Design an enzyme around this catalytic site. Structure first.
Site, short mmCIF file in Angstrom:
data_model
loop_
_atom_site.label_atom_id
_atom_site.label_comp_id
_atom_site.label_asym_id
_atom_site.label_seq_id
_atom_site.Cartn_x
_atom_site.Cartn_y
_atom_site.Cartn_z
N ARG C 53 -29.73 -74.59 18.47
CA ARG C 53 -29.22 -73.26 18.67
C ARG C 53 -28.31 -72.85 17.51
O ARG C 53 -28.43 -71.76 16.95
CB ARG C 53 -28.45 -73.21 19.98
CG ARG C 53 -29.32 -73.51 21.20
CD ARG C 53 -28.53 -73.53 22.50
NE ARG C 53 -27.50 -74.58 22.51
CZ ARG C 53 -27.16 -75.32 23.57
NH1 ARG C 53 -27.76 -75.16 24.75
NH2 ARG C 53 -26.22 -76.23 23.44
N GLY C 85 -31.77 -72.50 23.89
CA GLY C 85 -32.55 -73.71 23.68
C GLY C 85 -33.49 -73.96 24.84
O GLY C 85 -33.32 -73.39 25.93
N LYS C 163 -24.15 -64.83 25.86
CA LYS C 163 -24.08 -66.20 25.38
C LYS C 163 -22.70 -66.72 25.67
O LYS C 163 -21.73 -66.04 25.38
CB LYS C 163 -24.33 -66.28 23.88
CG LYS C 163 -24.56 -67.69 23.37
CD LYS C 163 -25.89 -68.25 23.85
CE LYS C 163 -25.84 -69.76 23.95
NZ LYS C 163 -27.13 -70.34 24.39
N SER C 233 -26.65 -67.44 29.08
CA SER C 233 -27.11 -68.63 28.42
C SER C 233 -25.90 -69.34 27.82
O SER C 233 -25.17 -68.77 27.02
CB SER C 233 -28.09 -68.25 27.32
OG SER C 233 -28.59 -69.41 26.67
N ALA C 234 -25.68 -70.59 28.22
CA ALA C 234 -24.56 -71.39 27.72
C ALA C 234 -24.94 -72.18 26.50
O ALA C 234 -26.13 -72.44 26.26
CB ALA C 234 -24.03 -72.32 28.80
N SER C 344 -34.99 -68.14 29.85
CA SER C 344 -33.74 -68.85 29.80
C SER C 344 -33.49 -69.40 31.18
O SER C 344 -33.76 -68.73 32.17
CB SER C 344 -32.62 -67.89 29.40
OG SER C 344 -31.35 -68.46 29.68
N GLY C 345 -32.95 -70.60 31.25
CA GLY C 345 -32.81 -71.26 32.53
C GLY C 345 -31.38 -71.30 33.02
O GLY C 345 -30.44 -71.30 32.22
N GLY C 351 -29.72 -62.25 39.62
CA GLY C 351 -30.82 -61.95 40.52
C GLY C 351 -30.60 -62.73 41.81
O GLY C 351 -29.48 -63.19 42.07
N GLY C 355 -34.26 -67.13 41.99
CA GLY C 355 -34.96 -66.15 41.17
C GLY C 355 -34.07 -65.69 40.04
O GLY C 355 -33.00 -66.24 39.81
O1 LIG Z 1 -29.24 -73.10 25.55
C1 LIG Z 1 -29.56 -72.65 26.80
N1 LIG Z 1 -30.80 -72.24 27.11
C2 LIG Z 1 -30.89 -71.82 28.37
O2 LIG Z 1 -32.08 -71.38 28.84
N2 LIG Z 1 -29.93 -71.79 29.29
C3 LIG Z 1 -28.77 -72.24 28.83
O3 LIG Z 1 -27.69 -72.25 29.65
N3 LIG Z 1 -28.51 -72.68 27.60
MG LIG Z 2 -30.39 -66.42 40.49
#
Ligand SMILES: Oc1nc(O)nc(O)n1
Ligand SMILES: [Mg+2]
Ligand SMILES: Oc1nc(O)nc(O)n1
Ligand SMILES: Oc1nc(O)nc(O)n1
Ligand SMILES: Oc1nc(O)nc(O)n1
Ligand SMILES: [Mg+2]
Ligand SMILES: [Mg+2]
Ligand SMILES: [Mg+2]
Lengths: 364, 364, 364, 364
Positions: C53, C85, C163, C233-234, C344-345, C351, C355
């Site tokens: 990243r 990432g 971010k 996104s962290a 992105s997770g 949501g 989801g």
């Molecule tokens: O670096 C990154 N990617 C994702 O998808 N989620 C987080 O929290 N950090």
């Molecule tokens: Mg959710």
């Protein structure tokens, strides 16, 4: 070929951290133009998709580029960057910086001292990795690296580091489209082949292994073929080999020496202890004389360590090289007193099977 | 050869969970003596060191052993246990239980219905895995499995599941000590060879590939050789192949049918939707007619999916088969509405390169 | 506040690859000074020790620095780099580049069009991550980002990317030495808290959640609190929040629009399909109108997806966010036809629980 | 309370391997009825989704069940099975089998000898894990285990092994539906809390920590609270605690003794060597007097080992406990000469922070 070599172990807080290097430059302890090599340990996974190696190389090159007013890519031809990923267990990320200056007008110290030389091969085709071309080109580069170092003979050679490529799916496809099968189709395994062929290249150039035995099919197969000086590290960040020959020379005036040995297996802390002793380092507190230790580790390919089964080669979650580095990093840390040491994994044709060569750099 | 086949998808809370099977038995919905096969998905990693497969098999065999007053190892000769590890993403652990009874009459429906037959090969030597012996023995077993099923012809054959071995360091050493190089020395890769040779065995028996082309060197090399019916799953838990042939037969009176297709790639949900539609299932709640789906998934060996690069073959933390299962499990779940489906990874010589065969079992 | 926005999806061969960006600049399709944001997907693991990243950010900044004759660190204040990432399954590494120019002297198109605004918060103390300070500062930044975008109201707001930082052992120790307990001591879990608090910051600023409910203890606990616009996104690469507000405006003349929706769970491809439809995209071949898709994915925290157990939160080898991205990346790829999309997770308070929000950018 | 204790370290080829145990029984070296405990090391990941622990327990119980004509579940009430997953690096899978017979006389040696006692707590509710109930119940069980052992005082107590539960998503949901927040919602972290509370239970019972300080909020927080005897291992395979107290007793006639120590950190091989020396074992082949070593290892929670940063707590691919076991397993292997030793990871409130208690069983 009359140099003075300085060697600096510097901590890293992250792969891109150049702050320890900027400190040496700004405190006048090293001149940017004199830096000829950096061997690093970065905290990526040390396998295929590890970009900490390239990231560290890119930041170091940028840092030096500023000072020398060069483009980073120019610096990478001037300086041998060898970044080994994977700092598992107590392994502490860091760089070892090697600087070379014309010999302080001797006034020559009473013994041989640390010298260093570097060389590069051409880029390899995907289909050449793990094979004869890689062996032969490496051997060539080892000799040029020796000459550059001013290493009179094999006896004075103590450590040959090589950085080598690996295969990706694109490289595999590119080879296939030329009607050439790559040595393997598994990217992980390709690292072993690249390391192995490169190590045999060192064994060739050092005459530890006769040329007659070095056929492609011996690579990864014939465990008996090995160099007791070779340290090979594969990476996605380059298509050629980078070679660093480190040894002793009459013409060097360095306030540093180097000795080498072999670990018989991953936990052979005794051999390290012994080689350290052979440099007159006694107590725990005389360890501060050691600049760094450099070592190869691997999972014993017979699946056993001192008669007991290990799981490092059956573990589909954690690759064997990661286990190996963790293990050997710990064994060495228990000796020198910390994990800021260079331990690289995958030691095919490097030292004994299940073991690996190591070297120690210390104050004279 | 006149059977009635029942098929039961049953949830698992853990690999050793037999509580769903005990429910079917105690509610009279299945008789222990009639169970001829269990195809499971267990939540281990689906690679070399996954013992959830063997654990599930051991508990199922023990459960059935109690009821049949048999030793577990006897049950394993009576019943084909095929446990596929790896339930990544939305994949939900479960067993599919297949029971076979002499044809129920009563009434015998119009047209062909679900039949099933099983077969076993001998144990393989380490050095035979991924090679000709494995191919040839598998082909043989496929035919015997067809006979046992009462499958009149290839046209009526819809799914060939095969469970196959893999290499460990000990097996590799054993082979070496006989002066025989194993097909590979990497345990992970060995699974691909085992799956591949076994799949080519199916292609041989089904005449999808002529015998002349099936030399050892074609295994994992020649992407053009494939079976559109083969589903191969490797495992550490056995030294032989287990074969389950599933198809249609006039002699069967099952209230169930089976259709098959090929996914062109890992995200080819369309083909699955199409095959489902070829069984008259057209709205979301009509999905309840589907008992289970069975599918092969793999990382596209060219490193691209629909022109875009993927990282599944360069990822040294997560093996490609795990990514592949996660991806294809999701693509299928988005169609049927959940992840309790059988998706097995590593599809070498199974369907197209980057894709894989699948089958669907549904209420008639 | 009358801009014209250009958006470019560009492939990456590796995290440091800037070659697609250099292409746009050298073909005149974008001017370096106009670039205001880059949202990337890099092939690191998307968790704590992912340096792809920072590496990608560093190379992009260097590339732009050359052209603008700026130091990289200056470029990072000028441009919002948001690198996510984790490109598991079919996810294909890439950047989405956003450029902003003063509105082509309208001649105003008949509808609202794509606008974008950016903002930054201050650096957070370790002990502030996942807590009130992070919430409140984020809310503030979201509003400034809206103003900068020329977004008249919430109705015209379609996507808020943020971010955010995470905790390392050093940051934890630093907090401890001030007598302040950090929100968690687990670095992995700290990402969830950072994402969560930041997402609640967005919900605060958008009035989706009343301020009264946003106490520290609600973070990660209260699943009902959420923003249907938030994408968090962290990352280890920064100590502050970076905010990108994307929406529609009367004053924008962009030849692009944006719509948003919510996936009810990880496999809810239908909602994506629907939102795409709401932008008049019919056939498969009209998909080329879509510039990119941006989506949040998570492992359903109840351990179930559509009634079936998943193992994404019990898997000690592969973190849940990796499974989630693999799953949702596949579900979306099956719709748009490839995996070069932004997924992105970790979607806590984004949501519905299990989801996540998504948005689509398309040609007008 | 006059026993004779036999202890047998036996190799495993896989988690379900009982062949070494069947050997001892069939060679008459141990009687099935006398076996009171098995402490194992299984080659699963030693974290949440590790079913090798339960699999090993199930096969051992079945093996003993055959010989004693008992159901496996009966054997598990008769015998304390404590399976610690995770055999990274040189760690070699194995069981330590403890057998107890009424005191052999014959002859009764001079001085105290190895005794062993076992105890169980009730099942815990999800919401009780890591909290006061777990602490208090464990303390109770430790005392009963001491009585059962015939351990006169704390001075004669050398090792308290405890097996404890962990949280899954279902357990978390179950707790939530009762309106009770579980101690954490992260399954990985839950292991630390379970191990920690259980270890504090041991410290309570041994009076190493006064009851007044043992509030819920001190768990994982207060590094100063610890037992120098506690070895806690969490697992998905049980809902209660299993306690094994090992010590010395005048009433015991075992030809075996036990001594204990603390490693100050993960590489503190010196302390192990010192404790071994306190049992008169002074040269490498005298190591054969050692039956097994039992040790706790953890990643130093300050992020440093002897002043150098480690990456074990920032590594999102490999959990800290896996690194820790690999490291400490190696450090110990370098001393005793192999990795077939019991090393368990995660040492919260066990020994010093970053270190852990260990014990050694040796021939008298
Ligand atoms: O670096 C990154 N990617 C994702 O998808 N989620 C987080 O929290 N950090
Ligand atoms: Mg959710
Ligand atoms: O990047 C890297 N590190 C190590 O230790 N070995 C190899 O082959 N590559
Ligand atoms: O256990 C297993 N699962 C799958 O999906 N593939 C193989 O080869 N083995
Ligand atoms: O199974 C297990 N092994 C270890 O080393 N630690 C825990 O908590 N569980
Ligand atoms: Mg070697
Ligand atoms: Mg295929
Ligand atoms: Mg401790």
């Amino acid at each position: 070929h009359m140099y003075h070599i300085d060697v600096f172990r510097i901590p890293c807080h992250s792969p891109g951290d150049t702050s320890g290097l900027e400190d040496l430059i700004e405190t006048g302890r090293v001149a940017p133009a004199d830096i000829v090599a950096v061997m690093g340990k970065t905290e990526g996974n040390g396998c295929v998709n590890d970009y900490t190696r390239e990231y560290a190389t890119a930041m170091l090159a940028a840092c030096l580029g500023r000072h020398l007013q060069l483009p980073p890519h120019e610096v990478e031809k001037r300086v041998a960057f060898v970044m080994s990923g994977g700092t598992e267990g107590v392994l502490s990320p860091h760089h070892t910086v090697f600087a070379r200056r014309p010999a302080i007008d001797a006034h020559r110290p009473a013994g041989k001292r640390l010298t260093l030389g570097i060389a590069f091969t051409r880029d390899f085709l995907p289909e050449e990795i793990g094979r004869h071309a890689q062996i032969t080109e490496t051997a060539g580069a080892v000799k040029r690296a020796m000459r550059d170092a001013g290493i009179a003979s094999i006896d004075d050679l103590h450590f040959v580091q090589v950085k080598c490529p690996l295969l990706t799916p694109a490289k595999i496809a590119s080879a296939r489209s030329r009607g050439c099968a790559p040595v393997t189709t598994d990217t992980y395994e390709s690292m072993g082949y690249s390391r192995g062929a490169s190590a045999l290249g060192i064994a060739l150039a050092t005459e530890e292994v006769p040329s007659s035995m070095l056929v492609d099919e011996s690579v990864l197969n014939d465990w008996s073929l090995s160099s007791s000086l070779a340290s090979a590290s594969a990476g996605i960040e380059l298509e050629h080999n980078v070679v660093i020959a480190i040894g002793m020379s009459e013409q060097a005036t360095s306030e540093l020496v180097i000795a080498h040995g072999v670990m018989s297996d991953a936990i052979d802390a005794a051999s390290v202890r012994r080689t350290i002793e052979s440099l007159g380092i006694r107590s725990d507190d005389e360890m501060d004389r050691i600049v760094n230790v450099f070592a190869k580790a691997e999972a014993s390919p017979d699946g056993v360590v001192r008669g007991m089964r290990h799981t490092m080669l059956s573990d589909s979650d954690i690759n064997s090289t990661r286990h190996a580095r963790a293990v050997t990093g710990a064994a060495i840390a228990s000796v020198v007193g910390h994990g800021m040491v260079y331990v690289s994994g995958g030691a095919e044709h490097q030292g004994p099977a299940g073991g690996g060569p190591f070297a120690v750099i210390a104050r004279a």
